[PDB]
Paper text:
AMPylation (or adenylylation) is the transfer of AMP from ATP to a Tyr or Thr/Ser residue in target proteins. Interestingly, in eukaryotic genomes only one FIC-domain containing protein has been identified to date, HYPE or FICD, and it is strongly conserved from C. elegans to humans. Here we describe the first crystal structure of a eukaryotic HYPE encompassing the two TPR-motifs, an α-helical linker, and the FIC domain of the human protein. We demonstrate that HYPE forms stable dimers with structurally and functionally integrated FIC-domains and with TPR-motifs exposed for protein-protein interactions.
Almost the entire structure of the HYPE construct is composed of α helices that represent the main secondary structure element of the TPR-motifs and the FIC domain, with the linker between them consisting of a single α helix. Overall, these intramolecular interactions likely result in restricted flexibility for the molecule, where the catalytic site of the FIC domain and TPR-motifs are accessible to cofactor binding and protein-protein interactions, respectively. In the structure of wild-type HYPE, the inhibitory glutamate, Glu234, from αinh is positioned in the vicinity of the catalytic loop. The low rate of autoAMPylation of the wild-type HYPE could be due to autoinhibition, consistent with the mechanism proposed for a number of putative FIC AMPylators.
Residue numbers in the entry:
A (entry chain A): 107 to 208, 221 to 433
B (entry chain B): 105 to 207, 214 to 434
Amino acid sequence: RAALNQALEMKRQGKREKAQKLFMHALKMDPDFVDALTEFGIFSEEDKDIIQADYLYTRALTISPYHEKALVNRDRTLPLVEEIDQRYFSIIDSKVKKVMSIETYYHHIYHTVAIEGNTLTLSEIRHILETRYAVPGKSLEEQNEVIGMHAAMKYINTTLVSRIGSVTISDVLEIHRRVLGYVDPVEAGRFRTTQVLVGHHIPPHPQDVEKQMQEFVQWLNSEEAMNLHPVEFAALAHYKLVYIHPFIDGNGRTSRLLMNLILMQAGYPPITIRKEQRSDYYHVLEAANEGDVRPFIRFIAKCTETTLDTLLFAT
Amino acid sequence: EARAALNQALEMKRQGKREKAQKLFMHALKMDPDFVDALTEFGIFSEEDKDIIQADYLYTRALTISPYHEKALVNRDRTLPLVEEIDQRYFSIIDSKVKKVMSALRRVMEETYYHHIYHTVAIEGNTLTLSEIRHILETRYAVPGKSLEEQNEVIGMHAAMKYINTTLVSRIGSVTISDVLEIHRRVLGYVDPVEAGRFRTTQVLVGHHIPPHPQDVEKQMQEFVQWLNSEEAMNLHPVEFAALAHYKLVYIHPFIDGNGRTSRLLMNLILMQAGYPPITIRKEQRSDYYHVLEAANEGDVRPFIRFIAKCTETTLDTLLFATT
């Protein structure tokens, strides 16, 4: 409460830089502080950050749903953010049109394995897949992760992308069998049998994983999922597979391959979440676990625009 | 010219020159390997050097073409129970050496653990050395300038035999089809995870042998595992049973790859369950090993059973000498 009142004294005087640090400290000490969430929200609106403000008012109302200062702001920002979000998707739709009218295989294998902790370079990955000979001084596990990724995405492109019909549970297992096959052939293509902790997240118990996955693939084929914008649907699918955590390993890699399978089936190019975005990528997943999937959907959307901007660099 | 080479070999055998006779006998068989008269005459010739095992093989080979050939029949009826005894006597020699090896032994056995992975992969064409295999399994880091497939074959072998030792050797009950598939899932898994632990779906040629069609593989494997658990297989000497199992899995050829590796792991699973140590067929014996499998495909499994038996005696002699 003292750090909040200290942040308000700075905001009233002028010092913006010292206020944000004092605001962030009050939320680090108590992240469910209803009054600091609303005051940091109205503060962020002064820098034209309405997306952040709405996040803060929604976080406030999840704790105290009848908080007058959060409710009065939430109700104003809610339809406004919905529009801002729709407008960014229509910007992405026009860039997909321009791309569709108009080397990268190794770049995606590099970022999908590097974001998980793999120390192999792009030139080393190229040597592994072109020659099929080992890279000196690197672990065989890291080199097998690369081989399995190449197998998984060659299978998706050859058998799943252009195929007509619903996505099955067998397709998810077939992808995982190739992702984790060369590293762990015993556990590759089969569900997790033990309960674990993933950071600060407890996924479903192994006895609930099969049903949770039957429900997930039922959602993937539902009309509600089709009605969504491809970028939202691709992002929600990615998140839900990471939430279920159906395998002991290779969940992030399979969820990123399912995400691009959804995008490629919608006429979008395959998307890459770069190594450098590891921290940003885990921050939005944490926020989705805490209660709001929108920051994640926006992170995936920005990833699609950057990919389209790189492809739009040709006539 | 085949009949002339036979009569030329008889001329030297009658006079004396035995070195020139064997070369002339072998030439008549190279020209025509289904020559009934040269097989009997070469059989009687080999008995003069006290080689009754070779003689019976030759008369047996001659009667698989012409079953009523008087000179083959009269000698085969004579040598048939004779080799049966000689064969039984070599197994009892092996049984006494198994006893003696059951009376550093643990450190010496694990010292030749990388030694078994080297020979089972080297006999299949793998170019990795024993020191390279040791680096792969101890460090889990890659060996420079070698293919990842060859290095994954080594990792899969280590996984397969660590799984056999930890969950199958001391296990009670019948051997299942799932146990064969589980071994294969580890043998091939790191090389080919798509085909590892599943039967072959295409028809192929393996040297000069056509194995069962993929639509018959499941039924022939159900029949094989039924034989493995039968009382007839239990009544056999462990060395004969281990060798016959090895041969029958190689004959079926149930997987697209790793058939030789899995058949040699099942061979030792049978031996270890019988109180025998794990056996190794060395890289140098590649040609001898394929010669006895060819003879078993042609009609006689005995040379193969004798090859496996001499492999167990050499393994027991190494264990009896290392602890001396």
